[model samples]
Every structure is written in structure tokens, then in C-alpha cells.
Target: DPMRDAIVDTAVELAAHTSWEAVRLYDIAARLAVSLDEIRLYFREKDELIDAWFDRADSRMLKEAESAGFLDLVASERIHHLIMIWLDALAVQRKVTRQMIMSKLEHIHIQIPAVMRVSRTVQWVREAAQRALEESTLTTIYLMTFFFWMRDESENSRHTRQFLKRHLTMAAWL
Candidate 1:
């Protein structure tokens, strides 16, 4: 079980950095100073490792949302915090991640619920946050905006923070 944890941790780190396809058995082994065969003993294939990493990420996100009193906070504030957390993490991982996956496009899908959750928390604010406004239309538009901003290869956490702050503050208040 300990070994499984180690493998899973490394897999997550690698997934955050590069395409899952780029992660090699030797990469984990080398990181742990073990042999490639040792990794094979636990993860029979690359997909198995990738799947476990994603499954864990998904489960952990939903768990944190539920356990952290997500429902109790001002819906807008809660959504803002959630978006900040997710965006901050992705921004931190963006440099290496650009090499492998479409992190920006993926981020759009991730941010929708954050917006929708906020929509449900207020009425006037809900007009923008509502299903029609956020889910059906605005989320992807915002995502596309974020993606292009992220595409320059020169962006960093500073940019991401400003971006999140600017857009989210508008969404929350304006």
C-alpha cells in the first residue's frame, strides 16, 4: 500500500507536468531510484497508472468540496474560492503541463460548476451565473478567453492570479 501511494503520487505529478503518454516507467523508477521493472510490478501499463491518477484527482476534488463546508459559504464566495484554488494549482503546473495536455481547454470544463454554484447562491447575480448564462453560454466563452491568454507560452502565476481576480471579481459583483 505504501508503494502504491508512492506510485500514485509520482503519477499525479507527472500528469500535471506532461501528457500522460510522455510519462515513462523509468521516470517514476528514476525518481524513486528504483528499476523500471519495479513499477511494472504495481502498474501493469501506462493507462492503469494514468487512470488511477485521474480517478484520484476527481474523487479528491468532490470530496474536498463536500467536506470543507462548501455548501455553507456564501455561494458566490465559495465558488470564487474554488475557482482560485483550481486555477492556482493549474497555473503552478502550467509550464510543464503545456508540453503534454490541453490544460486550458480542460480548465473551462472545470470552472463551470464554480460559476453555476455561485449563480444558485444569489438572485440578481444569478442572472449571469444561471444555467442559461453560465452553463449554456458564458463558461466556454470565458474558457476560450482564458485559453488564449494562457497560450502565449510567456504567462505565469502572476498573470493567472490577475486574470482570475479580474474576471471573478466581475462575475461576483458586477
Candidate 2:
């Protein structure tokens, strides 16, 4: 876990400066001054490396939600808090994430794990909010929110938060 965490953190830091495509496993290994086998022991390809980033984000978001007393909130409120946590986790790498999304568009296979992870996130929250919308439905909403979030540069995420609240309102009634 330590090795993988180091690799993912290094990869994200590298991405923040250059684009994700420009960051290769060798580059990561060299940046961390480690062996190829050490990197491979954690992630096979760059996509897997990025997937691990989302894995960390998901874990971090859930832990934040749990510690913040998310259980006491209503279904919509819980979703709101969770979504905010998700966006906050990505806030630091917005540009890098934008480039990653564009790259994934050109190479759809790389997006598969991300799509599956979104489904898992929806499933995880839905278990707590029995009245939550269906997984596919929620994933679409989350995708839309992510798209808006990528371009949202307003203060305190003003525009993105508004976008999330509006959709969450719609989702609650659906």
C-alpha cells in the first residue's frame, strides 16, 4: 500500500505540472528513484495508476463523510455532502483531470475502470440512502457534475456547487 500510494502521489504531482499523457511509468519510477519492478508491483499501466488515484479519493471521501456525521443527514443531504467531498478531492488537480478526461475520450478503454468506479460510488451511497436514485441514473448525474466541475473556476466552487445543488434537487424528486 505504501509503494502504491507513493506511486500514485508522484504521478498526480507530475501530472499537475505536465499533462497526464506526458507522464510515463518510467518517468514516475525515475521521479521516485525506484525500480520498474517496484512500480509494476503496484500498477501495470498508467490507467491502473490513475485508477488508484480515484481509489484513494473514494476512500478519503467516505472517511470524511463518516467522520463528519453523514449518517444523521437526510438522503439528499448525504448525497450533497458526499458529492462535495468528491469534488474537493479533485479540486487540486482540476486541470490534470481535464486533460485525463480528454485523453480518455480518445482512448475509451482507459475510461472503463473509472466508469466502473463511479458505479461503485453510487452503490456505496445508495446503500445508506434507500430512496436514492438508481445507479446508472446517479452515475449520469455525477458525470454531468464532473464535467461542469472541470470548468468551474468560480470562487469557493460557486458555479459547480450551484450545479450540484440543482441536479441534486432534481435527483431527489425523481
Candidate 3:
């Protein structure tokens, strides 16, 4: 069995119980009944786990494109689905996801990778949606929408849904 993902899922769950900043490898290790060294055998650092967390959603978003009906959807709708799918993948750990971002922001050196991540994520959004627009606007929209969704106070993230729809419709993606 691939225990690599097992380690990540445990951390997501544990972080939800508290905050991402307070979670320890030992806590995940104990919960999994595995040694700290074993956890290290996969994730070398705490930040590495966070990357995997984002990777999980990225992979899921890409996987959806492989679905039969996915390609048949409208272009804007395709982009909408991919963005929402990525968020839904992290929806289980949304609170902790915010904590992870906040914790990273507090330290200067830690944010460089995050910039690359946001760029890469937006690029993925472009490809999955087959858009031809400059990434600058899309990236700005994604991050702005991301922050808004992070603190969205509506039910089932409907606020984030309509928020994304409104902006995507308003933007001249053609």
C-alpha cells in the first residue's frame, strides 16, 4: 500500500483539530502508530507536507479533466469546474488550509515557494480550461478569489461559487 498519502491525510485531519502551526510530525506519527523516522522517510519537512496537501488538490483537479463529459462543457464552465474542484478537494481541511497559508506568510523566506505555487496553480487552471488569455489577470483573479473563498461566510461555499461565476463572467476571457 502507498502509505505516502496516508501520512498526508493524517496531517490534514490533525491540523483540523487544532491549527497547522501547532501540528507536529510526532502527532501524525503517533496517530498512525508509525515512527517519526518512518514519516520522515516520505515527507522530509513540515513544508513538504503542505506541498503535498496542495498537490493532492492539483492532482484531483487534473483527474477530473479525464472524465467523459468534462471536455464537452463550455470553456468558462470548464475553468469554473476546475477551480471549484480544486477547492472542494481541500474543502475537508479548509480551515487548516487557511492556517497553513497564514503561517507561511508570517515568515518571509517561506513565501517564495508559495508564489511559485500560486503561479503554477493558475497555469494549471488555464490548461484545464483551455484558455488563451494572459496569465497575469487569471492569476490575480485566482488569488483574489482564493482569499475571498477562504473566509466566505455562506452556506456550502455558495458565496465562493457565485463569487467565482460573477468574476469569470465579467472578465473578457475570449
Candidate 4:
């Protein structure tokens, strides 16, 4: 666990200092004073390592959702909270987050797994929102919300919240 944590933290530190595309596993290994083989022992690809970092954020968000009685909230409100929690979890990695998103936007092949992951997360959001819309529809809403959030630099992400409220209301009705 310590090695995994160390590797990711070092990677985040690197990503913060540079662009996500510029980060190299060897660089992380060098910074951690570990060998490339050491990095290979835990992660074969840098993307998988990044996914692990995201998994941590998702886990923490789920934990907070449980503690806050997320299920007790109204459908639209549950979605609202879920998105807010997700955004909060990634707030510390703002620059790298934008880079990652932009990279995904530029590469269609890269978007395959990314969209799949979003589909899965949106399924959970669909359940939490208690919405009966098609999975495709939910995925669209989430992708749109994500794009909005990325561009949203408003104070406290107020624009994102407002966007979610309006779109989620429409989503709930449909």
C-alpha cells in the first residue's frame, strides 16, 4: 500500500509540475528513488496508475456519500451531490485534470475506456437519482456536465451547480 501511495503521490507531484502528457513513469520512479522495475511491479502503464489515483478519489467520494445519507436525498439532489463530491475530490489536481480532459478530447481512441468508465459511474448516479432514463441518456448528461465543469471557473463552481440543476431537472422528467 505504501509503495502504491508513494508512486501515485509522486506522479501527482510530477503532473502538477508539468502536463499529464509530459509525465513519465521513469521520472516518477527516479523521483521516488525507485527503479523502473519497481514501477512495473505495481503498474505496467502510466494510465493504469492514473486510474488507480482516480479510484482513490472515487472511493473517498463514495465513503462521504454514505456518511452523508446520500440515498435519503431527492433524485435530482442526489445527482447534484454526487457531481459536487466528484468535483471536490479532484479540486486539488485542477491543472492536471484539465490536461487529462483535453487529452481525452483530442484522442478518440483514448476516449473509449474513459467513456466506458463514465457509463459505469453514471449507472450508479442513475440508481442514486432513481431515474429511469436510458443508460445512453444518462451518459450524455454526465459527459455534458463534465465538459461544463471543466470550463467552469466561476466562484465555488456556481455555474456548474446551476448547469447541473437545470439539466438534471430536465433529465429527471425525461
RMSD each, Å: 7.6, 2.3, 1.8, 2.5
Please state the error at residue 68 of candidate 3 in Å.
1.6
**Of the candidates numbered 1 and 2, which has the greater TM-score value?**
2
Judged by lDDT relative to the true structure, which candidate is superior, 1 or 3? 3
Candidates ranked, most accurate by TM-score first: 3, 2, 4, 1
Note the Cα lDDT for every prediction shown. 0.53, 0.78, 0.85, 0.77
lDDT per residue (tens digit) for residues 37-89 in model 2: 88887888887866776667687777866674666788887777788787788
- Cα lDDT over the full model 1: 0.53
Model 3, 1-174: lDDT tens digits are 369989999998998888788889999999999999999989878999988988899889989977888978988888889999989888877898888887876477778878888887888778877525568877777888889989986777899999888888788545
| Tens-place lDDT digits, model 1, residues 1-174 | 789769877866775566555778788888888988898899986656534543443344445466546656664554444544444444544544344334324556545644554344222223322222355233543454356445645545565556655665665564
RMSD value for candidate 1: 7.6
For candidate 2, give the lDDT: 0.78
| Candidate 2 C-alpha error for residue 91, in Å | 1.8
Off by over 4 Å in 4: 105-109
In TM-score terms, candidate 3 sits at 0.93
Best by TM-score: 3
Q: Which stretches of candidate 2 lie over 4 Å from their true place?
A: 134-137
- Segments in model 1 whose C-alpha atoms lie over 4 Å from true places: 11-22, 35-37, 45-60, 90-92, 102-133, 145-158, 168-174
Q: Write the per-residue lDDT of candidate 4 for residues 1-174, one digit (tens) a residue.
A: 988988888888899888799899999999999899989899898778758866876776678567657667876678778877887677667667777677666467667887677767877766666526677766777788777788788877898888888887887787
